[PDB]
Structure formats: C-alpha cells, structure tokens
Amino acid sequence: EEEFQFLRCQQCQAEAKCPKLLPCLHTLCSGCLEASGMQCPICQAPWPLGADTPAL
Ligand SMILES: [Zn+2]
Ligand SMILES: [Zn+2]
C-alpha cells in the first residue's frame, strides 16, 4: 500500500481528478479525455500493459 490512495495520469504525470481507462488499455486523466478528446498519448511508446484501473 501507499501513503496516498490516488491515481496518476501516465500522460500528464500529475494528479488525476477523474481518470479513465482508454479503449487502448491506457490510463489518462479527466481533463485529458475532454481536452485530448479521449486521445491516445500513452500510445507514443509500447508500454507494458496489464495494469489499468480507475481511482478509489
Ligand atoms: Zn492527463
Ligand atoms: Zn493507444
């Protein structure tokens, strides 16, 4: 467990208020979905999948 129970945008590298699991198995923040219109920034590199869940 960690001192904090929150997520972190893998594309913004900051606190995610309302992050979501993109259709490409990626983790983005709320603002990213609205701003990036559900884009695919994490698709920039073949990152290791298998871990993608919402915030507590
Ligand atoms: Zn973001
Ligand atoms: Zn992608």
Side-chain angles (χ1 to χ4, degrees), residues 24 26 40 42-43:
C24 221
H26 302 344
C40 241
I42 314 306
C43 245

Side-chain angles (χ1 to χ4, degrees):
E1 209 67 84
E2 208 56 58
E3 59 268 325
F4 74 103
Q5 47 179 16
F6 224 55
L7 296 187
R8 194 250 303 166
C9 198
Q10 295 184 48
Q11 100 99 78
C12 276
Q13 314 180 61
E15 283 166 286
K17 293 161 282 185
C18 269
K20 316 291 154 160
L21 312 178
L22 277 172
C24 221
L25 317 185
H26 302 344
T27 314
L28 256 65
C29 64
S30 130
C32 257
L33 244 57
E34 208 264 308
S36 232
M38 326 198 93
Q39 237 84 86
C40 241
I42 314 306
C43 245
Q44 284 161 241
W47 84 297
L49 303 89
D52 39 77
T53 15
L56 282 79

